[PDB]
Subunit: 260 residues, 6 copies
């Protein structure tokens, strides 16, 4: 059993349901460690497809990164072993398909988390925002890359630069979602597709998923370019604005950004 998730398996399909609603399923270390343990426990030959979901009737699918656990001490907020960074790698390397079944609003790191999964099926009332420019966070290269494989560059830059929510209808139209259904059809539609996938050849699915993962990462650059980017990110996480972003969030007020 798990403190922060609930797992139900029938036949070859496992549903991992978030159980962290008192914190709006924020991506706290304790929540992510339990989600990763649950996925690892399901890495068995008789499990063929995973669904990730919030409880039925959730207003908020996930509030994203826990803003209390963001470092404000001049440390990289999105280093390789940060919980958000660990869960996106683990989803992408997992040798079974992972479907995000979305009811409610999706924020920031949680939007990256569902974009790292294999398919997204969403309620017609679900909404999606990408929020680092609301907090002054310098998103990392891997995290940004995870957002660029579905919608085009102009659409991705609108989502990030405005931090404005988009509807499930627009998220379908721009190529982010696989399917949008009425919320009362969401579970039945998603289970039908998951159980269908579980009848197909699992070893062929696993190697094709791994081929897609490698090709998706195969945007290569030299060491100088990476180190130049890391210097730019460091200047951001050393900024007055980054302190103001976090301060405004916990004081429940609007940040005032100034460009330092």
């Amino acid at each position: 059993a798990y403190q922060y998730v609930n797992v139900v398996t029938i036949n070859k399909v496992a549903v991992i349901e978030f159980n962290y609603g008192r914190k709006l399923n924020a991506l706290s270390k304790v929540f992510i460690d339990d989600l990763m343990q649950a996925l690892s426990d399901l890495n068995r030959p008789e499990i063929r497809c995973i669904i990730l979901r919030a409880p039925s009737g959730s207003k908020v699918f996930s509030a994203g990164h826990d803003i209390h656990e963001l470092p404000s001490g001049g440390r990289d907020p999105l280093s390789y072993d940060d919980p958000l960074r660990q869960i996106t790698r683990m989803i992408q390397k997992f040798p079974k398909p992972i479907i995000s079944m979305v009811e409610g609003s999706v924020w920031g790191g949680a939007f990256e988390m569902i974009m790292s999964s294999d398919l997204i099926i969403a309620a017609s009332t679900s909404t999606f925002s990408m929020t680092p420019v609301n907090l002054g966070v310098p998103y990392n290269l891997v995290g940004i890359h995870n957002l660029t494989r579905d919608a085009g560059f102009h659409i991705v830059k609108e989502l990030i630069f405005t931090a404005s929510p988009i509807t499930a209808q627009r998220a379908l139209a721009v190529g982010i979602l696989n399917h949008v259904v009425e919320v009362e059809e969401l579970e039945d539609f998603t289970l039908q597709m998951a159980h269908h996938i579980s009848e197909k050849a699992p070893l062929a699915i696993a190697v094709i998923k791994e081929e897609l993962r490698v090709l998706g990462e195969a945007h290569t650059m030299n060491s100088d370019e990476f180190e130049r980017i890391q210097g730019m990110r460091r200047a951001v996480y050393d900024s007055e604005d980054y302190q103001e972003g976090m301060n405004a969030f916990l004081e429940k007020r609007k940040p005032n950004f100034v460009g330092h």
Copy 2:
């Protein structure tokens, strides 16, 4: 003349029509060798645009890889000089635009074949499936990469992991197709576009096509990553599941996959 295609030339446009209805235009070696000979013969300055089509009225555009020619046991079924691998490279390197004009159902390797062409114009009643997970086939890197340049990652993964057919309307909406037209207008519509392209500067078209080919291919990885992927693909084509998929296809029964 050719045993397995019929070629017609109208000014600067060449139409190559499959003549392999006996096997529903399956990508047999003898069919692909005639298709490649026909294209090579058309590599002349006075030809400016190619159309690939099945005969008018076809229910099946192409049934995909000839399953009777797929290597059994531990032989790579999608090696460099396999017919499907040869025709996709030839289409992509050919210095004139190649338009796939689609009537009927499109399966597996024939879907990768039309995706490798420059433009796809299809009948409102045409349908599209990608089927290696039905058979347990470890699709190759180059073949998967050919499926990723039009629709986004989540859509591609739905197509491959479900092996379910999509309509021409959905294939248009997700960016696979250029145009969908009523079947009685398909030929006229496609020829009008081909004649129009044929008025443009062919050397400019050829170098821009090759620039897009090179950029499309420019997802680079180290030797270890390629050899690791090759080891995973060999484990799949060595598996009981691969034998079961091939056998189930031939015996016309549902395969029973077990994950080894």
Copy 3:
């Protein structure tokens, strides 16, 4: 302050308006030098978002490359320091969002220019074409790469190989545009999005934009592939067809291309 653009600032938003209507805002060296000086002058902490536009009522947003300024006699027409190549780099490296607010028709290098910007909001009556195959021009790798980050390969190849205009509605559908609005609403809609972006964290916006730029460029090739392409481009700029394409534009007649 500039001969060929007008700049107005509204709180933290700067609007750079073309003032070259006597040449339909063609991308002449004198125009681009003024556009680049205006952008450089706006790289100030109190400026948070840029809008590029043509004057209200413009039938032609930009007629594209100044065809009089293209070299004739066996010279690369799209070298690293040609004005179109300079302005796309400058837009992409600029540390503030640049929104292209489009009224009227967009041609050739002007289409590449708006594609290189961060967001595109367009009038319902605006139209878009990519024209090098009309003139026999061997477009450069960087230039072509700039057209491939929004719509899929089949769509881009139709746009380039036909040189046919598409509508604002089709450009929205295929992923080129962010928004299409009635022309009477175009300025207010674009200014409210720009003001909204202007309240977000500028340093987070600048590092995410730069991360997207270098991931966008990170399609890598070996020296031989680049030099093989450059040799193909030189055969095109040495061709009879290239001279005929330039001649026909200047003599206002239909070119006759022959494939050498």
Copy 4:
């Protein structure tokens, strides 16, 4: 204990000594499994430097790949999980320096193995050969790359194309070896260098070793190039020459190669 190796620790230095002299320390699966187990068991904070050696007085350091374990059956002889391929990866990813201390003759896969290690210190009487052209073996990309980081291309090609042994003195002159010493001084010279390295910062050593490993692997190519090489390798392991080379070695006669 181990059946096929003997381990001695001298404070922070561990010496792994081959114990397979009855098969001239050929790289059979049982010998390599024991070497990898002994390395894995030494991956402890109190160990800082490894030495690999043959027993004192060995005329043969290692006879290379066990030719009885080379598959002939149209199967890739150097696939990702073959013992030679496993041991070179493990030596390179091991977070402590590994020094090859060589007495006797070094052959084929055993030469690649010492090349994959961090330093090579050798007896003045030791000799070195790279032998796949004697057998008709299509050596794999990773394996060849492991031979190209010390001596230059012309020297590597002489070694491989001639399969002729070189002296310790020539191996020093061309950059393959760190040091050549009289056999009576070999053990002490090597131990003093290992003890000296063991006084330095182990975390600094490990991250610099890992940085050198990933820069050394960072020669990148597209999927088509890898698949094209793999097709060429398969044609070699399907060849009559390959069968002739294996049979000639086992029958102790000169092979007769004919080029198919």
Copy 5:
């Protein structure tokens, strides 16, 4: 015109002499800023070649990184705008050849600095060491890469893992140095070569140097590999060993490293 360097111009050759003897030409910000200003001021068409030197008679060419300025606690010591990182970029991008003319002992960052220059001519009594493993420093990817273009991997790993000094004779034998001369001949030999270079075509020299720079940097990797290495680097600069290495250097005692 400079506090910390002296500049002598002989025909088209400029000789930049270090004037920071108080810290044995350690790479303090104040010294490096004056070295970079002097180089910038020499970027004129009438200057064709640069020589970098310590004063005639120097025991110590440069004592390396200023250990008093290296950030301690959890700050990256080798960030993009650290003085050593700036000076190696500037030397490599400088459009004239830069010859390191070496008398005395060369340590750590000063060794990387001379390795980044175009040619090295040294006195027979000069000596060379690479020192990060004496301090527990996690050297950065670009810094390590700068050390791998002259001697082979085994030799570079000996230099870095031992931090032992090598003689000029050995540095010449492994390919680090161009020439070794008696100290009395150092100025005559170096100036003769610099004068000879200055009669050659400067624009051909500049573009070839820049071609070599970009080919040298063209070892590419994906974002995940870079972020993984940066996480490992951060674990080292957070370590107790790193604090011990810095403290031991400042207290002029032997460090005791423990592996955390």
Copy 6:
């Protein structure tokens, strides 16, 4: 027969001897066309090794690129189809070893040509120079890359920036040559090694040569880097210095370079 080369076959070895003494075996278009035709004619299974040589007693091995065939200005002098660019690709792709057997002086493009071959065996009196900085020529990336796989960067930069000849003894010490022998021993020393290689497995040699070729080329960069380099090379071939370099050679005088 051939107008400009003489070919002899000794068992399985073919010796191609230059016959263009009248321009000292300068790499004129018609000379290189016959060398390439002679190689193609020898691409047969009963030939296993090629030797390239000048006639016995030659003072000049080859005077390098034919300076008279270089363009006068405003054109790239080393385009993909140039004869030097053609012969180095053909040597590198040729599926049999090519040994350069060198007697006399080797200049410029002929030095690149022998560097592109597999092995170099040279007379003790032979000499070697790299000459583009004598003429003001902007060497191409592929050409420079062909000079970097044997000697280190410092040595290569000395050779190119000085254009000074080096001895066979120095070329051996820095890793350019395989062997140096007295001129009376050169022919039979080289034939002994070629006969020995000719008894080895030719398919294994061919796939290993090709693996080394693609690994050598696998230094990758983005389109913007390449086009930036090309623009810099264009500024050189457009310069006054390039025309001065060509004029000085024609007028048999020392050039006066001024840096524009």
